[PDB]
Amino acid sequence: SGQRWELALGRFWDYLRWVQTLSEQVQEELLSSQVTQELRALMDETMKELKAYKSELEEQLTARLSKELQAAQARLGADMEDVCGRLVQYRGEVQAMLGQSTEELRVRLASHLRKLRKRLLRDADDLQKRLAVYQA
């Protein structure tokens, strides 16, 4: 409901913010698949809560707003998917480097995540304001 999918998105954010640091613990868990499994779990919880919320809104109301909303919905999902895909890719690349320095890979991952965070910010804000106008 209103804040349900938002609270779930907040939990994805909390985790992402820790991952962004790419400390050695993050790295241990990135390479063991724990980070990606958990972020993926938080993303799924988010999109499903959003789906349920938008479906309930759609149900109680008496259509451009609608199609745009779907798209805004897709944008957030894609932002979260990209984050996940970025981390999964990093793991794959590192495991193929045979112990060689991962420095450049991490600098690049960091930059990708900083950019996606700016996207998550505006995309969620856009979804929030659209869901609010949609309301019957």
Curated annotation (Swiss-Prot):
Phenotype upon changing residue 124 to P: In ApoE3*; decreased binding to LDL receptor
Top-level taxon of the source organism: Eukaryota
Impact when changing residue 4 to C: In LPG; ApoE2 Kyoto
Outcome reported for the amino acid change (mutating residue 116 to P): Decreased binding to LDL receptor
Annotated spans, LDL and other lipoprotein receptors binding: 112-122
Variant or mutagenesis effect after changing residue 117 to P: In LPG; ApoE2 Sendai; decreased binding to LDL receptor; induces intraglomerular deposition of ApoE-containing lipoproteins
Mutagenesis / variant outcome for changing residue 122 to A: Decreased binding to LDL receptor
Entry PTM: APOE exists as multiple glycosylated and sialylated glycoforms within cells and in plasma. The extent of glycosylation and sialylation are tissue and context specific. Plasma APOE undergoes desialylation and is less glycosylated and sialylated than the cellular form. Glycosylation is not required for proper expression and secretion. O-glycosylated with core 1 or possibly core 8 glycans. Glycated in plasma VLDL of normal subjects, and of hyperglycemic diabetic patients at a higher level (2-3 fold).
Result of altering residue 118 to Q: In HLPP3; ApoE2**
Phosphoserine modifications at: 101
Record-annotated disulphide pairs: none
Sequence repeats: 41-62, 63-77, 78-99, 100-121, 122-136
Mutation effect (residue 84 to R): In HLPP3 and AD2; ApoE4, ApoE3 Leiden, ApoE3**, ApoE5-Frankfurt and ApoE5-type; ApoE3 Leiden and ApoE3** are associated with HLPP3; ApoE4 is associated with AD2; changed protein structure; no effect on binding to LDL receptor; decreased association with HDL and enrichment in VLDL and IDL; may prevent the interaction with MAP2 and MAPT; changed interaction with APP/A4 amyloid-beta peptide; increased ability to induce APP transcription; increased C-terminal proteolytic processing in neurons; decreased function in neurite outgrowth; ApoE4 is associated with higher susceptibility to SARS-CoV-2 infection in neurons and astrocytes
Result of changing residue 25 to H: Confirmed at protein level
Distribution of this protein across tissues and organs: Produced by several tissues and cell types and mainly found associated with lipid particles in the plasma, the interstitial fluid and lymph. Mainly synthesized by liver hepatocytes. Significant quantities are also produced in brain, mainly by astrocytes and glial cells in the cerebral cortex, but also by neurons in frontal cortex and hippocampus. It is also expressed by cells of the peripheral nervous system. Also expressed by adrenal gland, testis, ovary, skin, kidney, spleen and adipose tissue and macrophages in various tissues.
Binding site for heparin: 116-119
Effect on the protein of changing residue 108 to C: In HLPP3; ApoE2-type
Glycosylated sites: 54
PTM sites of type Methionine sulfoxide: 97
Entry function: APOE is an apolipoprotein, a protein associating with lipid particles, that mainly functions in lipoprotein-mediated lipid transport between organs via the plasma and interstitial fluids. APOE is a core component of plasma lipoproteins and is involved in their production, conversion and clearance. Apolipoproteins are amphipathic molecules that interact both with lipids of the lipoprotein particle core and the aqueous environment of the plasma. (Microbial infection) Through its interaction with HCV envelope glycoprotein E2, participates in the attachment of HCV to HSPGs and other receptors (LDLr, VLDLr, and SR-B1) on the cell surface and to the assembly, maturation and infectivity of HCV viral particles. This interaction is probably promoted via the up-regulation of cellular autophagy by the virus.
UniProt record similarity statement: Belongs to the apolipoprotein A1/A4/E family.
Other remarks in the entry: Binds to and activates LILRB4 on acute myeloid leukemia (AML) cells which leads to suppression of T cell proliferation and promotion of AML cell migration and infiltration.
Implicated disorder: Hyperlipoproteinemia 3: A disorder characterized by the accumulation of intermediate-density lipoprotein particles (IDL or broad-beta-lipoprotein) rich in cholesterol. Clinical features include xanthomas, yellowish lipid deposits in the palmar crease, or less specific on tendons and on elbows. The disorder rarely manifests before the third decade in men. In women, it is usually expressed only after the menopause.
Subunit description: Homotetramer. May interact with ABCA1; functionally associated with ABCA1 in the biogenesis of HDLs. May interact with APP/A4 amyloid-beta peptide; the interaction is extremely stable in vitro but its physiological significance is unclear. May interact with MAPT. May interact with MAP2. In the cerebrospinal fluid, interacts with secreted SORL1. Interacts with PMEL; this allows the loading of PMEL luminal fragment on ILVs to induce fibril nucleation.
Protein name listed in UniProt: Apolipoprotein E
Organism: Homo sapiens (Human)
Taxonomic path: Eukaryota, Metazoa, Chordata, Craniata, Vertebrata
Gene label: APOE
Residues of the full protein shown: 40 to 182 of 317
